[PDB]
Amino acid sequence: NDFAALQAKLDADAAEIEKWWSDSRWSKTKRNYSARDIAVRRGTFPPIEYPSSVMARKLFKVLEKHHNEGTVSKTFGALDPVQISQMAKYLDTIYISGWQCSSTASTSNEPGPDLADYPMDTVPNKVEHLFKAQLFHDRKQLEARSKAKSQEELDEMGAPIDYLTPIVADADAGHGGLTAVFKLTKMFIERGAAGIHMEDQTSTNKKCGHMAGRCVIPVQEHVNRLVTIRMCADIMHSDLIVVARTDSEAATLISSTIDTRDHYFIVGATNPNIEPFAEVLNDAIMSGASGQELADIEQKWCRDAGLKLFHEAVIDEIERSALSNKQELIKKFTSKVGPLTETSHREAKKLAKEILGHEIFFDWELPRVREGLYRYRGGTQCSIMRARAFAPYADLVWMESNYPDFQQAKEFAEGVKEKFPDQWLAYNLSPSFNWPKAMSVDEQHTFIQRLGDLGYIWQFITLAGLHTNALAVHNFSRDFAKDGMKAYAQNVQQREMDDGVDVLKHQKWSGAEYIDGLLKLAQG
Amino acid sequence: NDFAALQAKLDADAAEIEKWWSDSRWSKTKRNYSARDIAVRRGTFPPIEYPSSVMARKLFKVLEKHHNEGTVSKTFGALDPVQISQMAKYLDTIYISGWQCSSTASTSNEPGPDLADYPMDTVPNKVEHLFKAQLFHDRKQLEARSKAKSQEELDEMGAPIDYLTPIVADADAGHGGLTAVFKLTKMFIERGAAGIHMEDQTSTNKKCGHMAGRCVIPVQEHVNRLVTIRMCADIMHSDLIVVARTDSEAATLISSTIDTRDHYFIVGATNPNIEPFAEVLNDAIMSGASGQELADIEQKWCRDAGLKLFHEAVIDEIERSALSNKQELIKKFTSKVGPLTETSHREAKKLAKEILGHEIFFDWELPRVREGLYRYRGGTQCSIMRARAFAPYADLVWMESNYPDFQQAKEFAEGVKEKFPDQWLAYNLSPSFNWPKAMSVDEQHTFIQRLGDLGYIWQFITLAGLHTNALAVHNFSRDFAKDGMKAYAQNVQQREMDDGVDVLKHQKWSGAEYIDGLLKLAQGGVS
Amino acid sequence: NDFAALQAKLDADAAEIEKWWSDSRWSKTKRNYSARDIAVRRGTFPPIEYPSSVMARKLFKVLEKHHNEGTVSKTFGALDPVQISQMAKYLDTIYISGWQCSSTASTSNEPGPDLADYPMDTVPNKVEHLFKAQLFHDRKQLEARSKAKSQEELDEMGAPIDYLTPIVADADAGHGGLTAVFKLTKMFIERGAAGIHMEDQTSTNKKCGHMAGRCVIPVQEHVNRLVTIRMCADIMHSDLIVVARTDSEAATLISSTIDTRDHYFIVGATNPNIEPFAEVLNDAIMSGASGQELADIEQKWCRDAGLKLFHEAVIDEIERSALSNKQELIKKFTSKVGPLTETSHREAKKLAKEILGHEIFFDWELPRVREGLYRYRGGTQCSIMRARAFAPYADLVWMESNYPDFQQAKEFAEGVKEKFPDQWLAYNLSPSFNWPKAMSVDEQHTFIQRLGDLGYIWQFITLAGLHTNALAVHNFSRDFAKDGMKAYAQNVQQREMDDGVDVLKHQKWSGAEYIDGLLKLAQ
Ligand SMILES: [Mg+2]
Ligand SMILES: [Mg+2]
Ligand SMILES: [Mg+2]
């Protein structure tokens, strides 16, 4: 129970951590705490190197190389060990999709649409599922190749597959408060994630309807998430890659107005003579309005309330006013109050009054939906503001897109790179989009490399594992019902033979010779 | 704490159970205990109807119909919810493969070759995995169709998919003793299995090597497994279908000689001057012999030892004696001592001595391998003997085959049906066989219906889910690395559009509208 | 694919559901949807009777009987199968504590303090853990008793233990949005919960500091949670008991001002010249103030800002005005604007202006903490307001208390019962309170019955399973290290013998004879 020895131990631990943090891997990484803050929080067990951290360091070097050479790590969302066993041959990262987990892999076995409302261990369990398969196939392959007696015999086995393919996994929106974020990160690190991504949505107001809309959280609240991930990683001595995703491009709601950076984008009513939306909608339900009647009331309320962003409200009032030099007043205002200027509403009100000589009515409480969420006009510029705020706390940033648009992706890349010219970018290639019909074959073929030239060094089709599986098993079910073993022979087996799929020899692929060898060793 | 009230309650429970058991579903089912034996063992909780038992009754009807009409329920092993969501459109049963589970679905997340050495909750967990997906997609689809406001609107949605596709699941070899068999069965029933299959292998001596060989257990030991499955089902009031599988067709070993029905097939040494195999092989290892030298010594020991079946040993001795009417003596012997006669070795020794006038040397301890397992000559007739023994305790029987052989499948079917003319048969369609090369296209096309005409009413490709997934994800990985989104557009999306794969609309398929509907219902209420 | 057949099927399903809902079990239950709304959502599988629903019906009857007779179902939080196997002998309900689960039972095996940040399957898994143990011991016991050949042999075995003890389980705050609430409820019903409780806290701003404070959600948001639980239960044909808990008695924060019922209680600044708290605290951190300096600045800001409830601000302004008959005016205002009147801030502003002849500054954005949460003055009356709102959607209501106070429990009971005279109440008996020191032995002895006479028909010590285990295993660890097998002989075994603990015969208790019997039957 020696006090001075404890202080000395912690100071030395702190210095080991400081030294770690001086590695070049961390050159862009902002930390909101000290080395000693971490030392006092990580217990007395010898520092563990987690296998995931090995893969994290490999992932960093893979991505760094793509960045330097202007190329792309392409991947897609993997379902299962079969899939990663094939992907390993052709791809240099693996993605794990929370969407695919919700439909195929919840730890409660209750499936459903993508709401991140499976139990929080679901995606970490999928990480373990794939990671331990990777390690197994790695062991199997080494043992097989160790049996070669000459260079020629080794050549006959084929080039080795690199099964140790770093995994980046969906951490959704944290699955609760910051303590959940911490525990989630811990599971991911324990179970084999080289990196994870977390998005600036709520965990309490997620929606899945087609028309439904989408709520984000205040900028700082997501920053604190990212800080908490890195804190857990620091406590566990992991080099975990962190991907910050913003969903603000199509956000229509925000959970709170507390962050001044958000204020530009928050929608207010300019009609002081209208009742609050929430109370109106509630009154209408109380007298038993139908679902169509409620859509009518809402759409008319929004029209009559005069919903605007504040800068629009101000500019509109200036154009109406008796003032001279309107165009130059507006240019002055707009240079102080813009999507990227992060001007607080208080500051913008001051400037507005100085110009108009009075205070215009603007109220962003009135339009709140019944859950209390504020109306919010998301878009590309909003996403740039947010990604810029996230960038110090994230190794890659990512604007969620539902529509592949080169120009918008250019605008986001350049917007971010204006403040962070070396920022790594990620891009999701939307599986909802009608690729075959809505862009030319040649554009399909080049799309990824063109985004690669913009600095999108990691790109992935979230749902490809799901779709390739669905197509193949649909077609074989159909063809098997019709043609029996002929369908298997021609549409599965022959194709496996032609394409050189190792699973064809399913006993060997599964590791039968590997385990047989363990048996022989033990009974020798 | 009234004694008479308890006796009366249990007698009434017994009579409910007796009445259940008189249902025609049970007409071929032999039970080795009474209704009251079960009543006293099932607790005081109201009898539960398990969802799995609903599916079991549906499965029985599906299979009964195929049997009566001479057709086949075709299926294959399913990996995941995506697969069963597509299979439900075209197939009337689902199979769950322990092979696929060991490579893709162990509850420890440690994969490997098919040794049933994942934790025993693995295949039951896979059942739940697929079953709850079935129920979810059923809920989703009903809700979607409920929105149709006219016959024409409903027609536009298409025919309904039957997502409630009965599942038959691999229960391996029981994962231990009879108490494990019981617990395994319980999990399966709780988690949604319409039927399970269990095989007469060991759980302690399973092998995976290419040439490795294969041990079975004594006939009665597997019978007791099947009895234990049915006992659990009876305790839980489930109509669970039970499939008895024998792996004896290519068995080379048996774990014990205790069952007299096995005796015909147990290999003995006829040379009384040879050392025990196990001790010879051990000595050779201890002198540092190489892996090839050990295969040489084993093959040499087997020929020096004069390994044969007893009836062969006897016939050989008769032919090499000085006796009259050898062919008639041999016919007399073989009519009493045959693969299907279930004659004990003692009885066969007695007949042999009555014919030859002396006792011949025959020792089946000497050939035992180092684990102590006996050498055993499996084959079609062996499988018939075993399936016949299993049949009273099983709704289907199944001879595991690695090689699709029409003539052998005919022999097994007829051999079993001679004693059990109404017996349902199952057949596995080997995914390792080279179908494209070793059968004409026409033979491929007809194979299943040809076995169907023999009474194989349930046939399945164990590993088809694995292979279709592997092929598609291999090809896309290759093509995606090369051609990027062009590959996705042409080789996935366009094909999904052309083939009418509902998953293409992935939000709707996943049930986004269903859950959106729950949200609206819950928030459609007043302050 | 016949349209008319589908409509007819759904109408018939709807009518079965309507019949179910006409049972007297549902007499106080408000439903915000129709029978057919449920019919179209529950799929084409035959209706399942879940074992949990059987236990729910038993639980309802147990609680109804206690209510009618003025008695109490006593229980406490159970850890494991050993515990419920003993509890079954003496108690008529079982409680499962989320607190105990976070320390002992997370499905990730990562423990920690009570933040409901284990994976959401954690408490449902604990339900299954205990429920399947109950069923097993029930089977064991029936088989054992079936071997008695006469009344005398049966008497020798003792009275039967009722192992089928209905379980009420902690559903925390829903573990996310309403879709999570739904999925959580579904697991609970599948895995054997006779009832669950859910509380009006956030799932995103939970705190554990002794310091720390406590955020609730808007009234309606929790109502919607309770509606969603009942909706899931209706889809699954379960009689599941629902307990609505409010944590508003010691709440200091609320997540949003959207619900007009909350407005009375929301703290506002009355000083129109003060900077926003969040921006002040941020500026102070950016200058690198220490943890003591920041505590100083917060308390200084709260002073300078003039934090009050609106009705206080109004009363203060009246006392400081030149108006006549101040006491009459204040009484008029407070009679229209009170904790239970659910008066919107707009309405209260209107009355205030009518009295004072001007509008007073009152701003509840300014005091928000940095996460954006509003300052909120919780208390007994707040909890009454909320429990009243919950009551139509809940079979029991429950004001979370950390201090056992008869008078406060009386106020809450009577406050609720004034609007809902048949409302069942639940009470948690605090394990953090110093019972031995801070009330007399006689008061200890009567406390539960005295609350029972107020209508608290279900009362439980959340953490008792944890504490009895901790005490016993601490003491044996100590004594075993010192005295070896002597400690085991005297402090465990002899005591087990004296007290008649069946586990002493551990083979028999574990069900060795039961399973041996299954073996015999098969062989
Ligand atoms: Mg996702
Ligand atoms: Mg198998
Ligand atoms: Mg709790």
Short mmCIF file of N, CA, C and O in Angstrom, two decimals, chain B residues 319-386:
data_model
loop_
_atom_site.label_atom_id
_atom_site.label_comp_id
_atom_site.label_asym_id
_atom_site.label_seq_id
_atom_site.Cartn_x
_atom_site.Cartn_y
_atom_site.Cartn_z
N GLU B 319 -15.19 -76.19 -47.42
CA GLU B 319 -14.68 -76.48 -48.75
C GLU B 319 -13.35 -77.24 -48.70
O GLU B 319 -13.00 -77.94 -49.65
N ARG B 320 -12.63 -77.10 -47.59
CA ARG B 320 -11.29 -77.69 -47.47
C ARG B 320 -11.31 -78.89 -46.52
O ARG B 320 -10.27 -79.33 -46.05
N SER B 321 -12.51 -79.41 -46.25
CA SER B 321 -12.65 -80.67 -45.53
C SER B 321 -12.99 -81.80 -46.49
O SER B 321 -13.20 -81.57 -47.68
N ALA B 322 -13.05 -83.02 -45.97
CA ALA B 322 -13.44 -84.18 -46.77
C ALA B 322 -14.85 -84.62 -46.40
O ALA B 322 -15.05 -85.66 -45.78
N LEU B 323 -15.84 -83.81 -46.79
CA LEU B 323 -17.23 -84.09 -46.47
C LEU B 323 -18.09 -84.10 -47.74
O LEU B 323 -17.73 -83.49 -48.74
N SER B 324 -19.22 -84.80 -47.67
CA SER B 324 -20.12 -84.92 -48.81
C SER B 324 -21.13 -83.78 -48.82
O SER B 324 -21.48 -83.24 -47.77
N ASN B 325 -21.61 -83.44 -50.01
CA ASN B 325 -22.72 -82.52 -50.16
C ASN B 325 -22.32 -81.14 -49.64
O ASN B 325 -23.09 -80.49 -48.92
N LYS B 326 -21.12 -80.70 -49.99
CA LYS B 326 -20.59 -79.45 -49.47
C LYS B 326 -21.54 -78.31 -49.80
O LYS B 326 -21.86 -77.49 -48.93
N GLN B 327 -22.02 -78.26 -51.04
CA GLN B 327 -22.91 -77.18 -51.48
C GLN B 327 -24.21 -77.15 -50.68
O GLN B 327 -24.79 -76.08 -50.49
N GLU B 328 -24.67 -78.32 -50.24
CA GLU B 328 -25.92 -78.42 -49.48
C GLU B 328 -25.70 -78.09 -48.01
O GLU B 328 -26.58 -77.52 -47.36
N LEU B 329 -24.52 -78.44 -47.48
CA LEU B 329 -24.14 -78.04 -46.13
C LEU B 329 -23.98 -76.52 -46.04
O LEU B 329 -24.43 -75.89 -45.08
N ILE B 330 -23.33 -75.95 -47.05
CA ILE B 330 -23.08 -74.52 -47.09
C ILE B 330 -24.40 -73.76 -47.22
O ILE B 330 -24.58 -72.71 -46.60
N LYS B 331 -25.33 -74.31 -48.01
CA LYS B 331 -26.63 -73.69 -48.18
C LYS B 331 -27.44 -73.75 -46.90
O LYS B 331 -28.19 -72.83 -46.58
N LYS B 332 -27.30 -74.86 -46.17
CA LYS B 332 -27.99 -75.04 -44.90
C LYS B 332 -27.49 -74.02 -43.90
O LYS B 332 -28.28 -73.35 -43.24
N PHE B 333 -26.17 -73.92 -43.79
CA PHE B 333 -25.53 -72.96 -42.91
C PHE B 333 -25.95 -71.54 -43.26
O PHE B 333 -26.40 -70.79 -42.39
N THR B 334 -25.82 -71.17 -44.53
CA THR B 334 -26.03 -69.79 -44.94
C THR B 334 -27.50 -69.39 -44.84
O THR B 334 -27.81 -68.21 -44.73
N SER B 335 -28.40 -70.37 -44.86
CA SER B 335 -29.83 -70.11 -44.67
C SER B 335 -30.16 -69.77 -43.22
O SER B 335 -31.18 -69.13 -42.94
N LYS B 336 -29.31 -70.21 -42.30
CA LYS B 336 -29.49 -69.94 -40.87
C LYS B 336 -28.60 -68.79 -40.42
O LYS B 336 -28.83 -68.18 -39.37
N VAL B 337 -27.56 -68.51 -41.20
CA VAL B 337 -26.57 -67.51 -40.82
C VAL B 337 -26.35 -66.56 -41.98
O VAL B 337 -25.55 -66.83 -42.88
N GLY B 338 -27.07 -65.45 -41.95
CA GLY B 338 -27.03 -64.49 -43.04
C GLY B 338 -27.07 -63.07 -42.52
O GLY B 338 -27.31 -62.84 -41.33
N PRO B 339 -26.83 -62.10 -43.41
CA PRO B 339 -26.73 -60.71 -43.00
C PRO B 339 -27.98 -60.25 -42.26
O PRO B 339 -27.90 -59.40 -41.37
N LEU B 340 -29.13 -60.81 -42.62
CA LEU B 340 -30.41 -60.32 -42.12
C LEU B 340 -31.03 -61.23 -41.06
O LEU B 340 -32.10 -60.92 -40.54
N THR B 341 -30.37 -62.34 -40.75
CA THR B 341 -30.95 -63.34 -39.85
C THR B 341 -30.69 -63.00 -38.38
O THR B 341 -31.29 -63.59 -37.49
N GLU B 342 -29.77 -62.07 -38.14
CA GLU B 342 -29.51 -61.60 -36.79
C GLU B 342 -29.14 -62.77 -35.89
O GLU B 342 -29.60 -62.86 -34.75
N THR B 343 -28.31 -63.66 -36.42
CA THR B 343 -27.86 -64.82 -35.66
C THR B 343 -26.64 -64.48 -34.81
O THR B 343 -25.66 -63.94 -35.32
N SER B 344 -26.71 -64.80 -33.52
CA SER B 344 -25.60 -64.53 -32.60
C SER B 344 -24.39 -65.40 -32.93
O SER B 344 -24.53 -66.47 -33.51
N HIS B 345 -23.21 -64.93 -32.54
CA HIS B 345 -21.98 -65.64 -32.85
C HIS B 345 -21.98 -67.00 -32.16
O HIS B 345 -21.54 -67.99 -32.74
N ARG B 346 -22.48 -67.04 -30.93
CA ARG B 346 -22.64 -68.30 -30.21
C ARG B 346 -23.47 -69.30 -31.01
O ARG B 346 -23.08 -70.46 -31.15
N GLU B 347 -24.61 -68.86 -31.52
CA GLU B 347 -25.50 -69.73 -32.30
C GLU B 347 -24.81 -70.19 -33.58
O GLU B 347 -24.96 -71.34 -34.00
N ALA B 348 -24.05 -69.29 -34.20
CA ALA B 348 -23.38 -69.61 -35.45
C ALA B 348 -22.22 -70.55 -35.22
O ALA B 348 -21.93 -71.41 -36.06
N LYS B 349 -21.54 -70.40 -34.08
CA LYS B 349 -20.48 -71.32 -33.69
C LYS B 349 -21.04 -72.72 -33.47
O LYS B 349 -20.41 -73.71 -33.84
N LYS B 350 -22.22 -72.80 -32.86
CA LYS B 350 -22.86 -74.07 -32.60
C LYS B 350 -23.16 -74.81 -33.91
O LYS B 350 -22.86 -75.99 -34.04
N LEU B 351 -23.75 -74.10 -34.87
CA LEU B 351 -24.06 -74.69 -36.17
C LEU B 351 -22.80 -75.09 -36.92
O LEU B 351 -22.77 -76.11 -37.60
N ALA B 352 -21.76 -74.27 -36.81
CA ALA B 352 -20.50 -74.54 -37.49
C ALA B 352 -19.88 -75.83 -36.97
O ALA B 352 -19.37 -76.63 -37.74
N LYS B 353 -19.92 -76.02 -35.65
CA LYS B 353 -19.32 -77.20 -35.02
C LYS B 353 -20.13 -78.47 -35.33
O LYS B 353 -19.56 -79.54 -35.53
N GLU B 354 -21.45 -78.34 -35.37
CA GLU B 354 -22.33 -79.45 -35.70
C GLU B 354 -22.09 -79.95 -37.13
O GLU B 354 -22.38 -81.10 -37.45
N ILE B 355 -21.53 -79.08 -37.98
CA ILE B 355 -21.26 -79.43 -39.37
C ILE B 355 -19.84 -79.96 -39.56
O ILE B 355 -19.64 -80.96 -40.24
N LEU B 356 -18.87 -79.29 -38.96
CA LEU B 356 -17.47 -79.61 -39.19
C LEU B 356 -16.98 -80.66 -38.20
O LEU B 356 -16.02 -81.39 -38.47
N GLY B 357 -17.62 -80.73 -37.03
CA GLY B 357 -17.22 -81.65 -35.97
C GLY B 357 -16.13 -81.10 -35.06
O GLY B 357 -15.74 -81.76 -34.09
N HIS B 358 -15.63 -79.91 -35.36
CA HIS B 358 -14.73 -79.21 -34.45
C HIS B 358 -14.92 -77.69 -34.47
O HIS B 358 -15.63 -77.15 -35.31
N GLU B 359 -14.26 -77.02 -33.53
CA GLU B 359 -14.32 -75.56 -33.41
C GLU B 359 -13.16 -74.91 -34.17
O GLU B 359 -12.00 -75.26 -33.96
N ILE B 360 -13.47 -73.96 -35.04
CA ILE B 360 -12.42 -73.22 -35.75
C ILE B 360 -12.02 -71.94 -35.02
O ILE B 360 -12.84 -71.32 -34.34
N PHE B 361 -10.76 -71.56 -35.14
CA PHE B 361 -10.27 -70.35 -34.50
C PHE B 361 -10.82 -69.10 -35.19
O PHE B 361 -10.73 -68.96 -36.41
N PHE B 362 -11.40 -68.22 -34.39
CA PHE B 362 -11.94 -66.96 -34.87
C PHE B 362 -11.97 -65.94 -33.74
O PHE B 362 -12.67 -66.12 -32.75
N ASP B 363 -11.19 -64.87 -33.88
CA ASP B 363 -10.94 -63.96 -32.77
C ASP B 363 -11.07 -62.52 -33.24
O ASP B 363 -10.27 -62.05 -34.05
N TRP B 364 -12.07 -61.81 -32.72
CA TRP B 364 -12.30 -60.44 -33.14
C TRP B 364 -11.78 -59.39 -32.15
O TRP B 364 -11.91 -58.19 -32.39
N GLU B 365 -11.17 -59.84 -31.06
CA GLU B 365 -10.34 -58.95 -30.23
C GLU B 365 -9.00 -58.60 -30.90
O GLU B 365 -8.54 -57.46 -30.81
N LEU B 366 -8.38 -59.57 -31.57
CA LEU B 366 -7.02 -59.40 -32.10
C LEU B 366 -6.90 -58.26 -33.11
O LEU B 366 -5.88 -57.57 -33.14
N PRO B 367 -7.92 -58.06 -33.95
CA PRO B 367 -7.81 -57.05 -35.00
C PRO B 367 -8.14 -55.62 -34.54
O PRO B 367 -8.01 -54.68 -35.32
N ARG B 368 -8.55 -55.46 -33.29
CA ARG B 368 -8.96 -54.14 -32.79
C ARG B 368 -7.87 -53.11 -33.06
O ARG B 368 -6.68 -53.39 -32.87
N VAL B 369 -8.29 -51.92 -33.49
CA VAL B 369 -7.39 -50.78 -33.58
C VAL B 369 -7.04 -50.27 -32.18
O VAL B 369 -7.57 -50.73 -31.18
N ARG B 370 -6.13 -49.30 -32.13
CA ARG B 370 -5.52 -48.90 -30.87
C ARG B 370 -6.51 -48.27 -29.89
O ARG B 370 -6.32 -48.34 -28.69
N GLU B 371 -7.57 -47.65 -30.42
CA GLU B 371 -8.64 -47.10 -29.57
C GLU B 371 -9.54 -48.20 -29.01
O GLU B 371 -10.37 -47.94 -28.15
N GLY B 372 -9.39 -49.41 -29.53
CA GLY B 372 -10.14 -50.55 -29.01
C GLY B 372 -11.38 -50.87 -29.82
O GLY B 372 -12.17 -51.73 -29.45
N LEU B 373 -11.54 -50.19 -30.95
CA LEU B 373 -12.70 -50.39 -31.81
C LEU B 373 -12.54 -51.66 -32.67
O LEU B 373 -11.43 -52.01 -33.08
N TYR B 374 -13.65 -52.33 -32.93
CA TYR B 374 -13.64 -53.59 -33.65
C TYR B 374 -13.79 -53.35 -35.14
O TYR B 374 -14.46 -52.40 -35.56
N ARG B 375 -13.17 -54.20 -35.94
CA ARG B 375 -13.32 -54.12 -37.38
C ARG B 375 -14.65 -54.71 -37.80
O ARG B 375 -15.10 -55.71 -37.25
N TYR B 376 -15.27 -54.07 -38.78
CA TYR B 376 -16.69 -54.24 -39.04
C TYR B 376 -16.86 -54.07 -40.54
O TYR B 376 -16.42 -53.07 -41.10
N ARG B 377 -17.46 -55.05 -41.21
CA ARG B 377 -17.68 -54.92 -42.64
C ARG B 377 -19.09 -54.43 -42.92
O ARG B 377 -20.05 -55.21 -42.94
N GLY B 378 -19.21 -53.12 -43.10
CA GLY B 378 -20.48 -52.52 -43.42
C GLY B 378 -20.83 -52.75 -44.87
O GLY B 378 -20.00 -53.18 -45.66
N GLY B 379 -22.07 -52.45 -45.21
CA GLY B 379 -22.54 -52.57 -46.57
C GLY B 379 -24.05 -52.44 -46.60
O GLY B 379 -24.70 -52.18 -45.59
N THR B 380 -24.61 -52.63 -47.78
CA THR B 380 -26.02 -52.40 -47.99
C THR B 380 -26.87 -53.28 -47.07
O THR B 380 -27.83 -52.81 -46.46
N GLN B 381 -26.51 -54.55 -46.99
CA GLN B 381 -27.31 -55.51 -46.23
C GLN B 381 -27.23 -55.18 -44.74
O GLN B 381 -28.23 -55.27 -44.02
N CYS B 382 -26.05 -54.79 -44.28
CA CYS B 382 -25.88 -54.31 -42.92
C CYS B 382 -26.83 -53.15 -42.63
O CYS B 382 -27.46 -53.10 -41.58
N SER B 383 -26.92 -52.22 -43.58
CA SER B 383 -27.77 -51.04 -43.42
C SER B 383 -29.25 -51.43 -43.37
O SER B 383 -30.04 -50.82 -42.65
N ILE B 384 -29.61 -52.45 -44.15
CA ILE B 384 -30.98 -52.94 -44.13
C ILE B 384 -31.30 -53.53 -42.77
O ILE B 384 -32.38 -53.30 -42.21
N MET B 385 -30.37 -54.30 -42.22
CA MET B 385 -30.56 -54.91 -40.91
C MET B 385 -30.81 -53.81 -39.88
O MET B 385 -31.74 -53.90 -39.08
N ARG B 386 -29.99 -52.77 -39.92
CA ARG B 386 -30.06 -51.70 -38.93
C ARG B 386 -31.31 -50.84 -39.11
O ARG B 386 -31.99 -50.52 -38.14
#
